[PDB]
Structure 1
Amino acid sequence: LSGIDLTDLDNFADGFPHHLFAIHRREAPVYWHRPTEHTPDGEGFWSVATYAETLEVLRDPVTYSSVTGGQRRFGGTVLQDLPVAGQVLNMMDDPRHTRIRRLVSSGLTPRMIRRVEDDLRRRARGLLDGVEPGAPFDFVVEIAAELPMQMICILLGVPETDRHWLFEAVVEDAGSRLYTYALELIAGKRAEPADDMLSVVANALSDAELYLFFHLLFSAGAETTRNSIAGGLLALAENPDQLQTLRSDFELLPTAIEEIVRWTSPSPSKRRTASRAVSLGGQPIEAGQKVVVWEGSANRDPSVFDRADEFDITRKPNPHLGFGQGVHYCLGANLARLELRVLFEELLSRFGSVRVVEPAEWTRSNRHTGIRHLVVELR
């Protein structure tokens, strides 16, 4: 570990670096990572790589805050302290967290879920019908990015005419245009309430807080869910025999989808801040210190998962942390599973041959594990 820098993104440019985390779990499940030139804020942090300790942190939001602690003015849930800590749901603590979380969940109505599902079915079929068998194409740009972006446009109530602002955002100007458009959409919901999540929250927060919420959702669909779809396809391509088994029996799909989420772990790390002295993994943490947990590593901890380094679509049980755990548990878990189920039903219905014909290209990040391009041939 002394020679390993978990903040050096050159180590994450080719996928989540599982080999480094095998060393981390073996050598020191919890340890103090000194800051390097690559470390946000030039400040060290406790790094947590094993499942039991990761789960312990996630399950104690009072000790391990998503806002701040000690003398630290602001924190949040990435390693860089952010002044928007305390102002968006995933960087909030009780009592305001419980209130806003319930308001957000009140927007995920059965009719909204049906609206998303109906659209998803129609679109997945259209896209898969358009595939030319045997002809290489970039599955990320043409399919994996498209479906969940449309899902979040429905949840947020973005009209077809205006969806390009969102696509274009996935340059500083692109970001400013997304921001400006989001503020216009939010004011529009205030003027004319609608039956969607943004309206629910806007009409219950400042516009700035509503933007943070908008972007949280936009990112969850446009990036995290896209990453699970692309990585699920890559995993199945790398395991053709399981692809065949799953194609032969879609009743296997729910268990397979949990294994895709464990395997891909698209959101592989989270930061918290200690609010008081506490011990974790037998080490003493002081109020104010940063704690980073690595669900991407926890999800391959062999203390918890048998043959943890193997993809197995029949895996049971499968208590993965890919959607988090505790009071901030992912509010979109069933929507993500829905996206994966519909896509793989439709894809595996038509194709039982998936070949990746160029090396996968990955996003360079230790906060997201994602594939930027994945050229495949489907037969």
Structure 2
Amino acid sequence: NLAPLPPHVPEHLVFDFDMYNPSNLSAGVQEAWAVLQESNVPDLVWTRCNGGHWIATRGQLIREAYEDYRHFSSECPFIPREAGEAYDFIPTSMDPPEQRQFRALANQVVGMPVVDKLENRIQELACSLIESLRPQGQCNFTEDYAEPFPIRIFMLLAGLPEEDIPHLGYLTDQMTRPDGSMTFAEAKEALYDYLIPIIEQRRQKPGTDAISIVANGQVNGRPITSDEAKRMCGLLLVGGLDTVVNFLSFSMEFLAKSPEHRQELIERPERIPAACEELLRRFSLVADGRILTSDYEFHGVQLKKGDQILLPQMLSGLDERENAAPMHVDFSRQKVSHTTFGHGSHLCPGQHLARREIIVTLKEWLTRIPDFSIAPGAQIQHKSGIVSGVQALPLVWDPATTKAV
């Protein structure tokens, strides 16, 4: 279950952290990962879990490694190694310079101009969901809002039918938080196979949706191939169907549990964008990594060619060296430092869509359903993985306190 220590890895750096089932999970997932930042724990450790890999535990090291693509390559960015080796998504599995032509196309389909284009749709969807939900006095938040709000927006953006959401959500779940029904590679291939006939249909007759744009793109002075388009659309789907969905649940769980923080935003709505950034720091949720292109000494530690190193995006903003009292949510925090959207050349291009979705959710939910709580009895369970998430979030409220605008 624990893989034997490789000869080059010193024993005193061993810390057996399981990224898919961390010891302290019951305390909350961010808290569970934060054990890597207790004072005894070295800045850079090796876990024997999940095949054996390095973990950088401080924001300083995490940022530094993400800037150095020469040594820390994204060709194999997932743990376990078998998943990383099968990982061939575009642009994420590519380093500069090769990454750049494909990254331009990815940004074209999720960037700010798309957010601006979809402004009314995003607003309308949040409004419609909340209006349907508010008179009920309860919801399963993950299922009833956290999933459908960003996913319907993504399927819209992608020109894909909503009928396919359960299938696609399942497949993407398996690549970030596998339940054991599928390997990463099996889930990837299933997603690729879903997309290829759609890509083939849309290559011929080009359109406005993300899949058409990718499929009709130009890269390296030539048409993008169907297979390249497949590798990129696959990534876009993983990106569009997981991170915002799970982040919204962390944020709403917190708000459900902190009336004082709800009040701040209700009474001072101009603070919502800042609050969004602080929630992005505190409830950061992504952890992937890189692979060593050659033997390299890093912060006094001998990394060997082929070693995998987890560089948890989640940990930077929780580092007390970066943010004092890091587990405390302060919407008035002066310098919100985080790498929630990553760092280096793979810095998330979808972050503007994400922020808009978070901000619209905060504004509309908190004003229409200002007063809500976790259902009595309930204990909220988190799950850990490449993207961490909330399993279920039962909320209750008095419908009489709710607003239609």
TM-score (norm 1): 0.87
What does residue 278 of structure 2 align with? 259
Q: Secondary structure at the match of 1:11?
A: coil
The correspondence for 1:274, drawn from 292, 299, 313, is 292
What does residue 50 of structure 1 align with? 58
Return the alpha-carbon distance in structure 2 between the equivalents of residues 367 and 324 of structure 1. Answer: 13
Residues 112-151 of structure 1 aligned to structure 2 (within 5 Å): 112-133=114-135, 135-151=137-153
Deviations 1:322-344 (A, max 9, x none): 00011100010000000001111
Q: Does 1:221 align with 2:240?
A: yes
Query: CA-atom RMSD, angstroms?
Result: 2.7
Which residue identity does 1:61 align to in structure 2? Y
The correspondence for 2:389, drawn from 366, 370, 378, is 370
Which residue identity does 1:185 align to in structure 2? I
- Does the 8 Å contact 1:16/1:366 carry over to 2? no
Query: Structure 1 residue 13: deviation in Å?
Result: 5.2
Identity of aligned residues (%): 22
Q: Does 1:302 align with 2:284?
A: no
Q: Secondary structure at the match of 1:308?
A: coil
Residues 206-355 of structure 1 aligned to structure 2 (within 5 Å): 206-267=225-286, 269-355=287-373
Q: Which sections of structure 1, spanning at least 5 residues, go unmatched?
A: 68-74
What does residue 9 of structure 2 align with? none
The correspondence for 1:359, drawn from 379, 390, 398, is 379
What does residue 71 of structure 1 align with? none
Deviations 1:89-134 (A, max 9, x none): 1111122101111122233466532343221111111111122457
Q: Secondary structure at the match of 1:107?
A: helix
Deviations 1:127-160 (A, max 9, x none): 1112245722201101110011112112222145
Change (3 A) 1:353 1:224: same
The correspondence for 1:97, drawn from 93, 96, 99, is 99
Change (3 A) 1:359 1:215: farther
Return the alpha-carbon distance in structure 2 between the equivalents of residues 2 and 61 of structure 1. Answer: 25
- Does the 8 Å contact 1:356/1:377 carry over to 2? yes
Which residue identity does 2:348 align to in structure 1? C
Return the alpha-carbon distance in structure 1 between the equivalents of residues 33 and 215 of structure 2. Answer: 43
Query: Structure 1 residue 355: deviation in Å?
Result: 0.2
Return the alpha-carbon distance in structure 2 between the equivalents of residues 164 and 19 of structure 1. Answer: 29
What does residue 201 of structure 1 align with? 214
Change (3 A) 1:87 1:148: closer
Deviates more, 1:112-121 or 1:192-201: 112-121
Deviates more, 1:127-136 or 1:349-358: 127-136
Change (3 A) 1:26 1:168: closer
Q: Secondary structure at the match of 1:373?
A: coil
Q: Secondary structure at the match of 1:306?
A: coil
Return the alpha-carbon distance in structure 2 between the equivalents of residues 23 and 156 of structure 1. Answer: 38
Return the alpha-carbon distance in structure 1 between the equivalents of residues 60 and 228 of structure 2. Answer: 34
Return the alpha-carbon distance in structure 2 between the equivalents of residues 56 and 214 of structure 1. Answer: 29
Q: Which sections of structure 2, spanning at least 5 residues, go unmatched?
A: 1-12, 174-180, 218-223, 399-405
Return the alpha-carbon distance in structure 2 between the equivalents of residues 311 and 111 of structure 1. Answer: 31
Query: Structure 1 residue 80: deviation in Å?
Result: 2.2
Which residue identity does 1:203 align to in structure 2? N
Query: Structure 1 residue 213: deviation in Å?
Result: 2.2
- Does the 8 Å contact 2:130/2:365 carry over to 1? yes
Deviations 1:201-259 (A, max 9, x none): 21124444433322322222221101111111111222221210111121101111111
Query: Structure 1 residue 290: deviation in Å?
Result: 1.4
Return the alpha-carbon distance in structure 1 between the equivalents of residues 89 and 249 of structure 2. Answer: 31
Deviations 1:139-185 (A, max 9, x none): 11011100111121122221456556535656669987754432222
Change (3 A) 1:100 1:159: same
Deviations 1:245-284 (A, max 9, x none): 11112110111111111111121x1211122333333322
Return the alpha-carbon distance in structure 1 between the equivalents of residues 211 and 24 of structure 2. Answer: 34
What does residue 72 of structure 1 align with? none
Which residue identity does 2:17 align to in structure 1? D
Return the alpha-carbon distance in structure 2 between the equivalents of residues 27 and 51 of structure 1. Answer: 17
Q: Secondary structure at the match of 2:29?
A: coil
What does residue 21 of structure 1 align with? 34
- Does the 8 Å contact 1:77/1:91 carry over to 2? no
Change (3 A) 1:149 1:12: farther
Return the alpha-carbon distance in structure 2 between the equivalents of residues 226 and 278 of structure 1. Answer: 37
Query: Structure 1 residue 78: deviation in Å?
Result: 3.5
Alignment: residue pair count: 365
Q: Secondary structure at the match of 2:297?
A: strand
- Does the 8 Å contact 1:256/1:313 carry over to 2? yes
- Does the 8 Å contact 1:124/1:147 carry over to 2? yes
